[PDB]
Write a protein that binds this ligand. Structure first.
Ligand SMILES: [Co+2]
Lengths: 107, 107, 107
């Protein structure tokens, strides 16, 4: 999928996560977040496909997206070890990270 | 997974999509479709594993499967921008494409 | 994701599978299992990251994880051809395999 679709999916699943009371739905949505990050691992924001592969702007985007995926994985492990509320705290921190990465290349 | 399992998953999720009233279940099933296409990206239909890698039949199969994945991504973006019904219209068009690709190598 | 998170996800989805009466939830959880195996395809158990890439211990781990993924795919095809209960029988056999692979490198 494209960058915008995946970022909106991440925000959607974050909305689904804060309204969760059991780790089942939590872990499900977190794995959907990791899924959306995996499908759009090479996607490019509409803001800057006309940039070179070794451009520091592009590398900024790439490492930020990797950061997203890594933070998702940490929250997934939290939701796997049983802790349904600590996973949601990590999910709100992830929401901060997702907000930043999206608002940087949203338009 | 194998080609047949993934194509039946696509048809199943298409059946789940037309009975949807909110973008949440829609986007969920569409991402499951993209997932099934990602897991079976190198799968071969039972009809023609005894073909060469550069055989135009095989390349036909490959580009058709890529077409499936791309059309799924477009429907996913539609279901991400909020439009739950335009996503279902794109999903019925995708159902046409999925029907063709499956009935070409079903047996 | 990491090995432990993915293995706990597999066990969780196995728990969700045995309580299933329709192939919809079955196939959904099985595809989540294949998803978790795909995300952690290169993950390393906490027990043995300090091993060489060509170490037979590491290769044992790798082929066992591939075995997990393959058995998941077989169960997914069973759950796709309509057979909701034969898929659950294959899922309990998969539970045996998952138990072994997890208890080998759990700590
Ligand atoms: Co992949």
């Amino acid at each position: 999928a494209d960058w915008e679709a995946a970022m909106l999916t991440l925000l959607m699943m974050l909305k689904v996560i804060e309204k969760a009371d059991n780790a089942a739905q939590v872990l499900t949505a977190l794995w959907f977040m990791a899924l959306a990050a995996h499908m759009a691992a090479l996607a490019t924001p509409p803001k800057l496909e006309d940039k070179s592969p070794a451009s520091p702007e592009m590398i900024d985007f790439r490492v930020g997206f990797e950061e997203l995926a890594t933070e998702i994985g940490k929250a997934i492990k939290l939701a796997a070890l049983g802790k349904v509320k600590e996973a949601q705290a990590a999910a709100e921190q992830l929401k901060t990270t997702v907000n930043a990465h999206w608002q940087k290349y949203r338009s």
